[PDB]
Design a protein around this ligand. Structure first.
Ligand SMILES: NC(=O)c1cccc2ncc(-c3ccc(Cl)cc3)nc12
Ligand SMILES: [Zn+2]
Length: 197
């Protein structure tokens, strides 16, 4: 039920991508293989301690959202947490990026722009190799709304995150950026394949 809800979010938020599948592959849906709840007490507490601090700075409201994250480093993330020291060249600078559309995070699973794809077949559209996405609790707090590229090193003054909003000459889909790794928790590890349309 918790997992059916995660599967529903994963499938229903897929969009057709402007790059025609170059980065993440060609698909309309996934084959969801496994959904695992990550239980890392030390990381959870690091997350909730910061969430409380952010809520206190944002009119008693954490502005928490469940968002996707794609990375070749899912294993390190679930053990050590998100780490801004790994994050300036990105559209919103040196942040940790999240999507509300699973297929946008799927474009980052094998690297920026999909890298060279899966390690076995070197295919960004591999229907064989199993992929992993994270479905994360993300504390946005007071989120700075931005439409165009703004290369920042940290959250804007008085803010806790950046929300990249869609615009005609800019973003096709939203994205959410934090500048402190403790503002996200890798709640669910989703193992899946993209499916041939
Ligand atoms: N990861 C996501 O799910 C993700 C979702 C949404 C937008 C992103 N934009 C940039 C990057 C990004 C990935 C790696 C590096 Cl090194 C820098 C930025 N990731 C993104
Ligand atoms: Zn493959």
């Amino acid at each position: 039920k918790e997992f059916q809800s995660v599967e529903e979010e994963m499938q229903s938020t897929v969009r057709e991508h402007r790059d025609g599948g170059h980065a993440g592959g060609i698909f309309n849906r996934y084959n969801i293989l496994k959904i695992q709840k990550v239980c890392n007490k030390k990381l959870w507490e690091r997350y909730t301690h910061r969430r409380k601090e952010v809520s206190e700075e944002n009119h008693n409201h954490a502005n928490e959202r469940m968002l996707f994250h794609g990375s070749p480093f899912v294993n390190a993330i679930i053990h050590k947490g998100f780490d801004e020291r790994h994050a300036i060249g990105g559209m919103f600078g040196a942040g940790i990026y999240f999507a509300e559309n699973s297929s946008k995070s799927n474009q980052y699973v094998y690297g920026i722009g999909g890298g060279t794809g899966c390690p076995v077949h070197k295919d960004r559209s591999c229907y064989i190799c199993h992929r992993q996405l994270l479905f994360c609790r993300v504390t946005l707090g007071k989120s700075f709304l931005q439409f165009s590229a703004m290369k920042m090193a940290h959250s804007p003054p008085g803010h806790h995150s950046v929300t990249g909003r869609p615009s005609v000459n800019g973003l096709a889909l939203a994205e959410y950026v934090i500048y402190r790794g403790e503002q996200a928790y890798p709640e669910y590890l989703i193992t899946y394949q993209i499916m041939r349309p």
